[PDB]
Design a protein around this ligand. Structure first.
Ligand SMILES: *[C@@H]1O[C@H](CO)[C@@H](O)[C@H](O)[C@H]1NC(C)=O
Lengths: 199, 48, 96, 48, 48
């Protein structure tokens, strides 16, 4: 179907073909001379004034090459930026998973794979997508026992069966509070929920 | 100028491509700001 | 540019010579709405742009990640908050 | 926060979604014979 | 008058080409700055 990446690859090919066609069309521009054909100039006009008309064509064609070279230097700078980004995505999404949030595509990024593409690389970013949600009352921390503070690790403290338990932030699964899913603090912050009988 | 060839068509094409990159970039920035944002419907500017 | 003003803006002279600046596809008011949504996405539940926790707790855990004990951090929450909003006011007054 | 608890929507089910991204790392290597382009076969042009 | 107008067309078209080349270079610096701003939104604002 119509796809953004396939369109991006075809845009690379089409932009190159359009630039090459535009450079070829610059050979048929008169540039203020009698004709754009050097044979037509030399088959109709004598050397002293033929040299003036050929000078008009040389100026036009050298100007077209200078403009094309300036555009090509700019485009290759953008390709260097893209290739540096693609090497960085290989290193930090494919060979490993760098702790950078939206670097390897949007969403909760799990892992990435790479495939070859015309003039580049195709990255397949795989993300953890929630399907259904549950509204739940959560606490971002608790004050327990001798006023010791605890904060949940990658999750929340929830009331389940009238007990304080933990759930992971990206999947609802009540499980017991332990040192595995908790950051300890020697003093609880104010507005941490008071749970004197926890642990 | 018309006898000069497709010089203005090239200048328009380059500036339109440059302006298309600026428009595309502003969408990537706006997408990046909005990515993953969830707000409550009970939010109000006047009171909170 | 079509007003009767004696003062001719140099932009009007440029536009009548074919040189004109078109507006961006999203207005700066829309982008201000997006930066406002991204900012309020850190204050209130679900805190979708603040690691899913209250903004003050995110500040506290970030300061503790530098090597600051949590004890002084949750004892000095008000001083940390006034330092935070004074740094905000210092940025605001720095444009004058 | 009612009591000390906030309301959050936590996922109860999930899936894996895939997203493509093409990154251009290469371009066609254009070479121009500037002499043949500017002046073609013609010695009168090459001298100038 | 054709010779005089041809000199003006050559000057004005050269001026446009120079402006277009500068504008391409400046928009490359703006793409790099926008990519850095998106990276700062993602890695300083939405997360640390
Ligand atoms: C999760 O979603 C899939 C697809 O709708 C479904 O097959 C599965 O039974 C669901 N599981 C739960 C626990 O809801």
């Amino acid at each position: 179907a119509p796809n953004s990446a396939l369109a991006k690859i075809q845009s690379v090919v089409n932009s190159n073909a359009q630039a090459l066609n535009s450079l070829l069309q610059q050979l048929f521009n008169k540039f203020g001379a009698i004709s754009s054909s050097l044979q037509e100039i030399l088959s109709r006009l004598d050397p002293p004034e033929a040299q003036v008309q050929i000078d008009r064509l040389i100026n036009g064609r050298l100007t077209a090459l200078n403009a094309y070279v300036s555009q090509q230097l700019s485009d290759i700078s953008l390709v260097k930026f893209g290739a540096a980004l693609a090497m960085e995505k290989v290193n930090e999404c494919v060979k490993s998973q760098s702790p950078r949030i939206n670097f390897c595509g949007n969403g909760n990024h799990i892992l990435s794979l790479v495939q070859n593409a015309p003039y580049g690389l195709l990255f397949m970013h795989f993300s953890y997508k929630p399907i259904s949600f549950k509204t739940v009352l959560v606490s971002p921390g608790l004050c327990i026992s001798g006023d010791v503070g605890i904060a949940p690790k990658q999750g929340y403290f929830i009331k389940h069966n009238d007990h304080w338990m933990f759930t992971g932030s990206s999947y609802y699964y009540p499980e017991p509070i332990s040192d595995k899913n908790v950051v300890f603090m020697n003093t609880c912050s104010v507005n941490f929920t008071k749970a004197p009988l926890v642990y | 100028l018309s006898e000069y060839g497709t010089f203005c068509d090239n200048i328009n094409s380059i500036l339109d491509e440059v302006n298309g990159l600026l428009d595309t970039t502003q969408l990537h920035v706006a997408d990046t700001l909005m990515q993953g944002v969830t707000l409550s419907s009970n939010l109000n500017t006047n009171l909170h | 540019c079509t007003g009767g003003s004696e003062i001719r803006d140099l932009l009007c002279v440029q536009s009548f010579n074919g040189i004109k600046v078109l507006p961006p596809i999203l207005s700066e008011s829309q982008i201000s709405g997006y930066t406002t949504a991204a900012t309020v996405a850190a204050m209130f539940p679900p805190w979708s742009a603040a690691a899913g926790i209250p903004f003050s707790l995110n500040v506290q855990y970030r300061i503790n990640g530098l090597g600051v004990t949590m004890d002084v951090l949750n004892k000095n929450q008000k001083l940390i908050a006034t330092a935070f909003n004074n740094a905000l006011l210092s940025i605001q007054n720095g444009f004058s | 926060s009612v009591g000390g608890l906030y309301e959050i929507k936590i996922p109860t089910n999930f899936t894996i979604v895939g997203q493509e991204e093409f990154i251009q790392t290469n371009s066609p290597k254009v070479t121009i014979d500037c002499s043949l382009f500017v002046c073609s076969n013609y010695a009168a042009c090459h001298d100038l």
